[PDB]
Design a protein around this ligand. Structure first.
Ligand SMILES: *C(=N)[C@H](C[C@@H]1CCNC1=O)NC(=O)[C@@H]1[C@@H]2[C@H](CN1C(=O)[C@@H](NC(=O)C(F)(F)F)C(C)(C)C)C2(C)C
Ligand SMILES: *C(=N)[C@H](C[C@@H]1CCNC1=O)NC(=O)[C@@H]1[C@@H]2[C@H](CN1C(=O)[C@@H](NC(=O)C(F)(F)F)C(C)(C)C)C2(C)C
Ligand SMILES: [Br-]
Ligand SMILES: [Br-]
Ligand SMILES: [Br-]
Lengths: 302, 301
């Protein structure tokens, strides 16, 4: 009953967040086993932009880094730069390290963000990797080091670490190996995201969520082909729908008795006519940050 | 940068969630120190749907009818009492991860984070508002009862909600942690209806301030108005009346934007009487009312 933008429980990640201080710069780190992962621009100041990280790191020693888990100080015994993240080796292993893995998500996938400041968790919310490799998050100054994650069984899959905000108000970051999502660099210079698109497979998953919860006015008796659908979808800046996407919506087709191409034809008419002052799941816009798997998980058993 | 529906970190509450089994019925409980709190209808079955005599059913139940499971460790019940619609199960083991907490009764218009759980395992977290009709617009499946809503005020977890039922319109109802329902609802399967809901005016205003802080300012005009004149219009659109308390609580956001509260009221009045001009505010084509002034301040610090 009901459908909400839902984040994963953040407990397993809260126990890994620490404060990383280097000189006057403070951000968050991720403490897993005896390593703290954090954005490399912690070694910079307003002075340090060409943010030539190589030089800045060379002049640093281990005592220049203060890692704080709450009030307990963790001693740094090593420091290394892997792409855009800094790996600080510490003498103490995190006793709350969950079973984890580092994954690189694809555009269209969703994840939970634990927004932190000064190593202290502030809030949790759900995001999606946009097609242009940005995310529409909520981050303030000092938020860098906050991570995005999924919980798969008992395993925390870390997929995002926050680095910067672009002039359009969207956010950009890396995986836990320091590799940015999208064509961005961790330097304050003129950078742009690129035209974003609507995640079509997710809109369809959300329309299936609407049917499961009673909203079914947008359903029509028409059907269509994938190519005919994609021809219309291109015009409205929608991502093209693939046969993989059709198969992943199968569970929702099974739960509703509505064929995917029948839902595609219902989506086609909504795009060309609008909602006529009506709402879908209490929204006057089409929502695209629910994957089919999110919908299946949330509507399980209805 | 950006504005999202943001829940509190749920870690402190995840460590209090347990499974309560009574016969064939399984739901969630809240384990604080040596007491487990759960909805009393865990002692019922489909048979008891007609005249559910909880007093009777509970006395007919003993301690061995309750199986409490914290992960794999079973907690033995050594006492049980019924406070209104919640059951207090005395257990032999105290939760070593019990946070500093208090039980509070929230007011309509206030928000809280919900930790949705099933079989004692936390599944997801999201933010909710206590609607003016004392329902909440949540997402719960079978077995979700016992899930709790909470706020974190400094170092204290303030528990304010325990989930009990879904109403025919798809909205949800529950009690505070003292067993007293929010709204005119009872914990039995009988004909119940929520009642006409209204829009939380002070929250819409706080959300308009959040949009201005984040760059959205097309709805800003040079107009202003009075409290009474605004309320005369808002009443027509099924908006809750704005009080001077609400005007004072929007003060922090007026300070952050330099926009007087009554000027933002005049912007909302125009939005109500003219529409949103096919435009969006913070990515919404409707006015949002589930962000309190505190939620915005905390997120936009
Ligand atoms: C991490 N602590 C912050 C997070 C930012 C601050 C405001 N909200 C956020 O999401 N990240 C930064 O300050 C990074 C950091 C230097 C500059 N920077 C930026 O986000 C800047 N933006 C850009 O350079 C742009 F637009 F190109 F993306 C800033 C102008 C400060 C907003 C580094 C190393 C990239
Ligand atoms: C707790 N585990 C469930 C949660 C429900 C199930 C589906 N989604 C939810 O939020 N609560 C219940 O099953 C409660 C429980 C008996 C009946 N009930 C209901 O929610 C029923 N609704 C009503 O009686 C109504 F409409 F009046 F609110 C039901 C018909 C099963 C949906 C008790 C003791 C209230
Ligand atoms: Br939502
Ligand atoms: Br404008
Ligand atoms: Br007046």
């Amino acid at each position: 009953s009901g459908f909400r933008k839902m984040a994963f429980p953040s407990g397993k990640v809260e126990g890994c967040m620490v404060q990383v201080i280097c000189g006057t710069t403070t951000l968050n780190g991720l403490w897993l086993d005896d390593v703290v992962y954090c954005p490399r621009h912690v070694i910079c100041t307003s002075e340090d932009m060409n943010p030539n990280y190589e030089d800045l790191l060379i002049r640093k020693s281990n005592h220049n880094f203060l890692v704080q888990a709450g009030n307990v100080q963790l001693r740094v015994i090593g420091h290394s730069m892997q792409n855009c993240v800094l790996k600080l080796k510490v003498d103490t292993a995190n006793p709350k390290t969950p079973k984890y893995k580092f994954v690189r998500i694809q555009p269209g996938q969703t994840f939970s963000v634990l927004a932190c400041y000064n190593g202290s968790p502030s809030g949790v919310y759900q995001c999606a990797m946009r097609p242009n490799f940005t995310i529409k998050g909520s981050f303030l100054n000092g938020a860098c080091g906050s991570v995005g994650f999924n919980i798969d069984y008992d395993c925390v899959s870390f997929c995002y670490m926050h680095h910067m905000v672009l002039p359009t108000g969207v956010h950009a970051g890396t995986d836990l190996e320091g590799n940015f999502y999208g064509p961005f660099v961790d330097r304050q210079t003129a950078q742009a995201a690129g035209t974003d698109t609507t995640i079509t497979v997710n809109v369809l998953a959300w329309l299936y969520a609407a049917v499961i919860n009673g909203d079914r006015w947008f359903l029509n008796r028409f059907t269509t082909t994938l190519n005919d659908f994609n021809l219309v979808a291109m015009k409205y800046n929608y991502e093209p729908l693939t046969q993989d996407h059709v198969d992943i919506l199968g569970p929702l087709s099974a739960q509703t008795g509505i064929a995917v191409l029948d839902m595609c034809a219902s989506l086609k008419e909504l795009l060309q006519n609008g909602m006529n002052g009506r709402t879908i799941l209490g929204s006057a816009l089409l929502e695209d940050e629910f994957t089919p798997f999110d919908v299946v998980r949330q509507c399980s058993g209805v």
